[PDB]
Amino acid sequence: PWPASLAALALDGKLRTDSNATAAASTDFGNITSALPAAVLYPSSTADLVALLSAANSTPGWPYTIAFRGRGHSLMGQAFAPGGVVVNMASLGDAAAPPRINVSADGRYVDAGGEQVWIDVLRASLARGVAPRSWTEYLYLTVGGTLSNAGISGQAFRHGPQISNVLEMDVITGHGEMVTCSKQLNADLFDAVLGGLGQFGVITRARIAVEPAPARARWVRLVYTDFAAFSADQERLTAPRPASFGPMSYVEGSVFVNQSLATDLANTGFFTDADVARIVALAGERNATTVYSIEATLNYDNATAAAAAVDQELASVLGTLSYVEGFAFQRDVAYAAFLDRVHGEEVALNKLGLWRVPHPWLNMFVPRSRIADFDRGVFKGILQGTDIVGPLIVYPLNKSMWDDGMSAATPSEDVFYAVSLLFSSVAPNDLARLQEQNRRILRFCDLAGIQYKTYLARHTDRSDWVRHFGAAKWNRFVEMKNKYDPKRLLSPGQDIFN
Numbered sequence: 001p002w003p004a005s006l007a008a009l010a011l012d013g014k015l016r017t018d019s020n021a022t023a024a025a026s027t028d029f030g031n032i033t034s035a036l037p038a039a040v041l042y043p044s045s046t047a048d049l050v051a052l053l054s055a056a057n058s059t060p061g062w063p064y065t066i067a068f069r070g071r072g073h074s075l076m077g078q079a080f081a082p083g084g085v086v087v088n089m090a091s092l093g094d095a096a097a098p099p100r101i102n103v104s105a106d107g108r109y110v111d112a113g114g115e116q117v118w119i120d121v122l123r124a125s126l127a128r129g130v131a132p133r134s135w136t137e138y139l140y141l142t143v144g145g146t147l148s149n150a151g152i153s154g155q156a157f158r159h160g161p162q163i164s165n166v167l168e169m170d171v172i173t174g175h176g177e178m179v180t181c182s183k184q185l186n187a188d189l190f191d192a193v194l195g196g197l198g199q200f201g202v203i204t205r206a207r208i209a210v211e212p213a214p215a216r217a218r219w220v221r222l223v224y225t226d227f228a229a230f231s232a233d234q235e236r237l238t239a240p241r242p243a244s245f246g247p248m249s250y251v252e253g254s255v256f257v258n259q260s261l262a263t264d265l266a267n268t269g270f271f272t273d274a275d276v277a278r279i280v281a282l283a284g285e286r287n288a289t290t291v292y293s294i295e296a297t298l299n300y301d302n303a304t305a306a307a308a309a310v311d312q313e314l315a316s317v318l319g320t321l322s323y324v325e326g327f328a329f330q331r332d333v334a335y336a337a338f339l340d341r342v343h344g345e346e347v348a349l350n351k352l353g354l355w356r357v358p359h360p361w362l363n364m365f366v367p368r369s370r371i372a373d374f375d376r377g378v379f380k381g382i383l384q385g386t387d388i389v390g391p392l393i394v395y396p397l398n399k400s401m402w403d404d405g406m407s408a409a410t411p412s413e414d415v416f417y418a419v420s421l422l423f424s425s426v427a428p429n430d431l432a433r434l435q436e437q438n439r440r441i442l443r444f445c446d447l448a449g450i451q452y453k454t455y456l457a458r459h460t461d462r463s464d465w466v467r468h469f470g471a472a473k474w475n476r477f478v479e480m481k482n483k484y485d486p487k488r489l490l491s492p493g494q495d496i497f498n
């Protein structure tokens with residue numbers, strides 16, 4: 001027996017069971033796992049979301065799990081609702097009116113629908129001379145999707161993750177109740193939802209902090225053959241000054257294994273063939289099995305004196321560093337071209353047929369005290385003698401910029417590294433080898449007693465999720481699940497309560 005508001009969605013053709021609808025909502029970016037839903041909802045408004053979730057809340061014995069598909073960038077089925085209902089979030093942004101992205105009158109924040117993609121949040125913000133302060137490396141992800149994880153990039157050391165740059169949200173709980181939440185209003189829901197893995201409700205609107213939009217980014221790469229010098233410099237560039245930070249707007253880093261060195265440097269799209277020859281000769285001279293590169297930017301505007309001020313500011317910061325003499329490499333681009341840089345890698349890989357392939361990505365947070373051990377056992381150990389396809393990203397984060405009361409789990413140390421090994425299974429049937437190598441890396445960290453946290457991964461065992469949050473923080477997560485999704489129907493693909 002269906003409620004009238006739920007039956008109206010099927011009448012209006014918003015609730016589909018056809019093979020085309022279910023097939024599209026059954027695969028994700030990871031391209032490793034698949035799960036067909038029973039139905040797909042294409043909501044035209046937030047009232048359609050209220051109708052589905054209230055039906056779920058009031059119907060006794062309701063058997064359908066519900067997932068909120070952003071862009072399906074999930075790696076291991078986190079956006080699937082096996083034999084359930086997948087919400088096609090993008091349908092909320094179909095009409096020309098009402099607008100889904102509103103920059104505030106005062107220009108201090110930006111209101112964006114949960115379904116909206118960060119690239120559109122950027123374009124709408126830039127039209128009003130503003131931009132969010134904390135980003136992901138890839139802009140074709142949804143506001144609600146990244147906020148359900150953390151949302152990290154080279155800006156998070158100073159501005160914190162995307163979850164630390166949200167003023168307020170509109171959420172529809174598992175009870176079908178539309179609640180506006182912040183630190184001052186319904187704080188418990190606001191904190192549970194940020195990094196909440198879609199467990200407590202759907203974010204329909206997020207109010208994102210903005211800053212005056214820079215016009216350009218001075219973009220640098222610094223080369224090292226010594227991991228200790230590389231990691232020490234990343235920490236210097238990202239350390240809090242004796243609340244204040246250094247001038248860098250973005251700090252990331254990358255690891256290049258010797259075996260494929262020339263090809264990998266040439267594939268960054270940053271280095272010229274002359275730059276490549278020099279770094280390859282440097283590696284041979286130092287007899288390095290690994291090469292490290294700091295990637296950093298300095299944001300600046302259209303002011304007449306800006307270019308010279310940046311040259312001086314950059315010359316000053318570089319003098320404090322310990323990269324191999326003469327191995328500083330500069331580029332200067334428009335701010336939006338820098339932010340949207342990964343979209344170019346997508347275009348080039350898609351035409352080669354190397355984008356829509358399995359992505360057995362390994363993403364983790366490694367405490368600073370164990371990063372050199374990780375480098376020895378992984379970059380200089382396990383990954384040696386292998387053909388790597390995908391970037392190996394390493395960069396420090398400041399725990400002070402993360403709110404531990406939110407759902408997102410991080411290591412206890414003040415400084416911890418985001419470690420992103422973006423393996424693409426390009427070779428014929430290389431998937432099984434990559435999945436085993438990820439199990440080996442994790443086993444190496446477990447045996448060495450490294451207290452890491454995974455990021456973007458879903459655990460399949462209860463004991464793993466309990467260790468992921470930590471026992472006390474886990475009990476708190478359960479408290480919020482009981483309050484907001486007692487029926488355990490939301491985002492079943494996380495495998496926390498399903």
Ligand SMILES: *Cc1cc2c(cc1C)nc1c(=O)[nH]c(=O)nc-1n2C[C@H](O)[C@H](O)[C@H](O)COP(=O)(O)OP(=O)(O)OC[C@H]1O[C@@H](n2cnc3c(N)ncnc32)[C@H](O)[C@@H]1O
Binds near residue numbers: 146197
């Ligand atoms: C594929 C990809 C992912 C990625 C990235 C680059 C690429 C090519 N770069 C990232 C980066 O630099 N930093 C970062 O923190 N994450 C990065 N990612 C991962 C990305 O954040 C995740 O894939 C995330 O899931 C966002 O993707 P998407 O927007 O496509 O969301 P989804 O996969 O469909 O769903 C994820 C889970 O969240 C729940 N969900 C989705 N939308 C909502 C809303 N509006 N409200 C509540 N929950 C929501 C889903 O149910 C699912 O469980």
Ligand SMILES: *[C@@H]1O[C@H](CO)[C@@H](O[C@@H]2O[C@H](CO)[C@@H](O)[C@H](O)[C@H]2NC(C)=O)[C@H](O)[C@H]1NC(C)=O
Binds near residue numbers: 258259260287288289
């Ligand atoms: C870095 O990797 C390269 C392979 O690209 C190694 O260079 C090869 O080494 C073997 C063994 O002496 C030679 O037979 C090949 O002809 C070399 N190839 C090229 C393209 O130069 C090199 O040994 C590696 N360095 C380290 C420190 O492992």
Ligand SMILES: CC(C)=CCNc1ncnc2[nH]cnc12
Binds near residue numbers: 138
């Ligand atoms: C945290 C995370 C998975 C970041 C991913 N970033 C990227 N994802 C995919 N391709 C990339 N190239 C450079 N950076 C890339």
Ligand SMILES: *[C@@H]1O[C@H](CO)[C@@H](O)[C@H](O)[C@H]1NC(C)=O
Binds near residue numbers: 031032033357
């Ligand atoms: C992965 O993508 C390929 C090519 O688009 C497709 O044939 C296959 O169904 C996908 N597999 C999974 C498990 O999603």
Ligand SMILES: *[C@@H]1O[C@H](CO)[C@@H](O)[C@H](O)[C@H]1NC(C)=O
Binds near residue numbers: 098099101102111
């Ligand atoms: C944007 O503002 C309009 C009013 O101008 C409103 O109807 C709409 O709900 C807003 N969109 C978001 C995402 O807040």
Ligand SMILES: *[C@@H]1O[C@H](CO)[C@@H](O)[C@H](O)[C@H]1NC(C)=O
Binds near residue numbers: 287289
């Ligand atoms: C170069 O480094 C390799 C790999 O670590 C090692 O086998 C070899 O002893 C080194 N050669 C010299 C001359 O140090």
